[PDB]
Design a binder for this molecule. Structure first.
Ligand SMILES: CC(C)S(=O)(=O)NC[C@H](C)c1ccc(-c2ccc([C@@H](C)CNS(=O)(=O)C(C)C)cc2)cc1
Ligand SMILES: C=C(C)[C@H]1CN[C@H](C(=O)O)[C@H]1CC(=O)O
Length: 262
């Protein structure tokens, strides 16, 4: 018999956010955003009931080198705590080895956020100077990209970042953004282009994304390996793409009510 599907996700604007009047509400109704709408669409097209839950440890999914335990949403999937993850979860080799990803539902790449006026146009620009500090989230796919890169510029950047004092790493998107905004052009933040483009359209309208992306990848919906949900979820993602629903949802949550003009 069908059993209610436990969705693991995480608060990250505009993917999942607490409604302002969330306290008056209950269950799935508490939340709003791109991934909330997407979960509704997937569930509709797969014929399942579901429960949105916020990941306990606030993490996306990494493996501890010593203990080999997976944390975050990937962890919830691997250890049987959740049946599906619907979040801006980057498709990576290390994650795909232990869970299944759908086809991607959104494209992104690592990108550069600056406070307007910062004299930086590219990663190379960043790598060749020291006056403007720059960094990434303290863990996640961006940091791993830098840690593992053999590309000259990116190698030089990682070498700088891992040793910079005080730390150039941040714990949350909100923190990286606040640091850009409050550092008077002396901090640039390396983050996924999706969040970058989102932030650029929000007041106080004092940041921007500069240069091309450093890589090209996607977010995927994740299921435990061998789940019966894998195939229908994947097909649902293809369908939503082809029906224009993914485009409509990204417009809805990024641009339709952009706050920095046209
Ligand atoms: C991690 C990498 C292997 S990757 O991200 O999967 N691909 C790398 C390559 C550069 C790339 C990167 C991103 C995309 C890409 C293209 C489209 C989309 C959305 C809009 C729809 N995805 S879909 O699979 O094409 C669709 C028909 C459902 C999402 C991601 C396609 C290819
Ligand atoms: C917001 C976080 C911590 C997530 C979102 N996608 C990446 C991931 O799935 O690891 C992380 C961002 C990043 O690494 O820039």
């Amino acid at each position: 018999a069908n059993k209610t599907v436990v969705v693991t996700t995480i608060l990250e604007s505009p993917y999942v956010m607490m409604k302002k009047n969330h306290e008056m509400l209950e269950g799935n109704e508490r939340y709003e955003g791109y991934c909330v709408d997407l979960a509704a669409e997937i569930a509709k097209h797969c014929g399942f009931k579901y429960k949105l839950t916020i990941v306990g440890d606030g993490k996306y999914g990494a493996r501890d080198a010593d203990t080999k335990i997976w944390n975050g949403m990937v962890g919830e999937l691997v250890y049987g705590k959740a049946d599906i993850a619907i979040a801006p979860l980057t498709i990576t080799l290390v994650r795909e080895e232990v869970i299944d990803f759908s086809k991607p539902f959104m494209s992104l790449g690592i990108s550069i956020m600056i406070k307007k006026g910062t004299p930086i146009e590219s990663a190379e620009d960043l790598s060749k100077q020291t006056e403007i500090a720059y960094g990434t989230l303290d863990s996640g796919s961006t940091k791993e990209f830098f840690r593992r890169s053999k590309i000259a510029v990116f190698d030089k950047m990682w070498t700088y970042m891992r040793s910079a004092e005080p730390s150039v790493f941040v714990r949350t998107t909100a923190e990286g953004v606040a640091r850009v905004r409050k550092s008077k052009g002396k901090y640039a933040y390396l983050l996924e282009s999706t969040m970058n483009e989102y932030i650029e359209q929000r007041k106080p309208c004092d940041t921007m994304k500069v240069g091309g992306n450093l890589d090209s990848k996607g977010y995927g919906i994740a299921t435990p390996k061998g789940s019966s949900l894998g195939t229908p979820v994947n097909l649902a993602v293809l369908k939503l793409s082809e029906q224009g629903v993914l485009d409509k949802l990204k417009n809805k949550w990024w641009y339709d009510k952009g706050e920095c003009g046209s």
